[PDB]
Design a protein around this motif. Sequence first.
Motif, PDB file in Angstrom:
ATOM      1  N   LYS A  90       9.873 -12.619 -24.354  1.00 23.65           N
ATOM      2  CA  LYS A  90      10.490 -12.882 -23.054  1.00 23.65           C
ATOM      3  C   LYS A  90      10.455 -11.654 -22.148  1.00 23.65           C
ATOM      4  CE  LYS A  90      14.685 -14.545 -20.867  1.00 23.65           C
ATOM      5  NZ  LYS A  90      15.372 -13.369 -20.255  1.00 23.65           N
ATOM      6  N   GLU A  91      10.769 -10.481 -22.702  1.00 28.47           N
ATOM      7  CA  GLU A  91      10.765  -9.254 -21.899  1.00 28.47           C
ATOM      8  C   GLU A  91       9.353  -8.835 -21.468  1.00 28.47           C
ATOM      9  OE1 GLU A  91      13.134  -8.082 -20.271  1.00 28.47           O
ATOM     10  OE2 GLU A  91      12.657  -5.950 -19.932  1.00 28.47           O
ATOM     11  N   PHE A 127      17.163 -19.350 -24.702  1.00 25.59           N
ATOM     12  CA  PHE A 127      17.649 -18.613 -23.545  1.00 25.59           C
ATOM     13  C   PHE A 127      18.236 -19.579 -22.556  1.00 25.59           C
ATOM     14  CE2 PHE A 127      13.999 -16.303 -25.293  1.00 25.59           C
ATOM     15  CZ  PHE A 127      14.627 -15.105 -25.632  1.00 25.59           C
ATOM     16  N   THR A 184      10.805 -13.520 -30.306  1.00 26.18           N
ATOM     17  CA  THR A 184      11.105 -14.276 -29.083  1.00 26.18           C
ATOM     18  C   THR A 184      11.742 -13.440 -27.960  1.00 26.18           C
ATOM     19  OG1 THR A 184      13.234 -15.224 -29.881  1.00 26.18           O
ATOM     20  CG2 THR A 184      11.245 -16.477 -30.307  1.00 26.18           C
ATOM     21  N   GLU A 185      12.694 -12.565 -28.284  1.00 25.30           N
ATOM     22  CA  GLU A 185      13.342 -11.767 -27.241  1.00 25.30           C
ATOM     23  C   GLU A 185      12.349 -10.764 -26.606  1.00 25.30           C
ATOM     24  OE1 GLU A 185      16.911 -10.359 -29.203  1.00 25.30           O
ATOM     25  OE2 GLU A 185      18.085 -11.988 -28.205  1.00 25.30           O
ATOM     26  N   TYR A 231      11.454 -28.374 -20.825  1.00 25.30           N
ATOM     27  CA  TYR A 231      11.516 -26.911 -20.868  1.00 25.30           C
ATOM     28  C   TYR A 231      12.689 -26.338 -20.052  1.00 25.30           C
ATOM     29  CZ  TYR A 231       6.736 -27.056 -22.789  1.00 25.30           C
ATOM     30  OH  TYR A 231       5.647 -27.296 -23.557  1.00 25.30           O
ATOM     31  N   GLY A 232      13.169 -25.158 -20.442  1.00 24.91           N
ATOM     32  CA  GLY A 232      14.003 -24.395 -19.534  1.00 24.91           C
ATOM     33  C   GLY A 232      13.192 -23.267 -18.916  1.00 24.91           C
ATOM     34  N   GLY A 233      13.363 -23.113 -17.597  1.00 24.56           N
ATOM     35  CA  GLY A 233      12.749 -22.031 -16.806  1.00 24.56           C
ATOM     36  C   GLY A 233      13.450 -20.724 -17.051  1.00 24.56           C
ATOM     37  N   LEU A 234      12.710 -19.774 -17.591  1.00 25.20           N
ATOM     38  CA  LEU A 234      13.216 -18.447 -17.759  1.00 25.20           C
ATOM     39  C   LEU A 234      12.978 -17.619 -16.511  1.00 25.20           C
ATOM     40  CD1 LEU A 234      11.877 -17.639 -21.300  1.00 25.20           C
ATOM     41  CD2 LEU A 234      13.904 -18.890 -20.634  1.00 25.20           C
ATOM     42  N   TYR A 235      11.774 -17.776 -15.917  1.00 25.59           N
ATOM     43  CA  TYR A 235      11.389 -17.040 -14.690  1.00 25.59           C
ATOM     44  C   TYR A 235      10.598 -18.027 -13.802  1.00 25.59           C
ATOM     45  CZ  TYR A 235      12.717 -13.119 -17.520  1.00 25.59           C
ATOM     46  OH  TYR A 235      13.432 -12.270 -18.332  1.00 25.59           O
ATOM     47  N   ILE A 251       7.649 -19.190 -16.161  1.00 23.90           N
ATOM     48  CA  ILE A 251       7.721 -18.861 -17.594  1.00 23.90           C
ATOM     49  C   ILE A 251       8.771 -19.766 -18.212  1.00 23.90           C
ATOM     50  CG2 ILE A 251       8.183 -17.072 -19.387  1.00 23.90           C
ATOM     51  CD1 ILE A 251       5.575 -16.608 -17.404  1.00 23.90           C
ATOM     52  N   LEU A 252       8.367 -20.536 -19.227  1.00 22.97           N
ATOM     53  CA  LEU A 252       9.194 -21.654 -19.718  1.00 22.97           C
ATOM     54  C   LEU A 252       9.370 -21.526 -21.234  1.00 22.97           C
ATOM     55  CD1 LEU A 252       7.210 -24.632 -18.041  1.00 22.97           C
ATOM     56  CD2 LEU A 252       9.088 -23.198 -17.036  1.00 22.97           C
ATOM     57  N   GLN A 253      10.533 -21.954 -21.738  1.00 21.17           N
ATOM     58  CA  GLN A 253      10.793 -22.025 -23.158  1.00 21.17           C
ATOM     59  C   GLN A 253      11.058 -23.483 -23.480  1.00 21.17           C
ATOM     60  OE1 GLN A 253      14.591 -20.623 -24.706  1.00 21.17           O
ATOM     61  NE2 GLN A 253      13.517 -19.741 -26.515  1.00 21.17           N
ATOM     62  N   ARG A 308       8.275 -11.280 -18.786  1.00 19.24           N
ATOM     63  CA  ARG A 308       9.013 -11.006 -17.527  1.00 19.24           C
ATOM     64  C   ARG A 308       8.202 -10.011 -16.685  1.00 19.24           C
ATOM     65  NH1 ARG A 308      11.441  -6.957 -15.625  1.00 19.24           N
ATOM     66  NH2 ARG A 308      11.709  -5.895 -17.600  1.00 19.24           N
TER      67      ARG A 308
END
Lengths: 105, 99
Positions: B21-22, A4, B17-18, A98-102, B42-44, B25
Amino acid sequence: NLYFQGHMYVTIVYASVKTDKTEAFKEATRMNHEQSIREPGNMRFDILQSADDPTRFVLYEAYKTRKDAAAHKETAHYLTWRDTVADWMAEPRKGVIYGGLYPTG
Amino acid sequence: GHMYVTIVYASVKTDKTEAFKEATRMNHEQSIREPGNMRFDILQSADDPTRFVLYEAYKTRKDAAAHKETAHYLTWRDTVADWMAEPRKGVIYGGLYPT
């Protein structure tokens, strides 16, 4: 491609410190934290100590952008910290990206 | 320094994964509204897009304990349960700085 889009650039830094340098390491890292939170685009520079093991630390270093994060390694306070704590590491630090999603911002 | 932080490591099944994420969220949006919450990032992982971190930080341990009693936590836990490629691990820290 299952990645993402990032909204924060984060590096979780893991540090294992020599048993008789934990206080020394905290003090040196305090100085790094105090300056780093003033860097443009810094969103966190949390300094954490493991509840289970006081020799285990995490630096949670979050910036608005990758280039803000990149600038950190150029700063005098970083360079000072790195040189200072070198001999107190019980093993090499590891930094995980990491990338921050939220939050999105 | 007494901020209470739990770093939660989640390994997700490849085709979830999608959805992960939802579902997460919705947990994040409610959790940042909890009294005493300071982060719920929240990190990937950039190394492996199936690995995620929830960085959950609270002013006190008591506030952290409350999160696990919330409707949004319980719903998240039930939703993502079958999507874990292995058991999640939470690692507890005290935040030294900021003080």
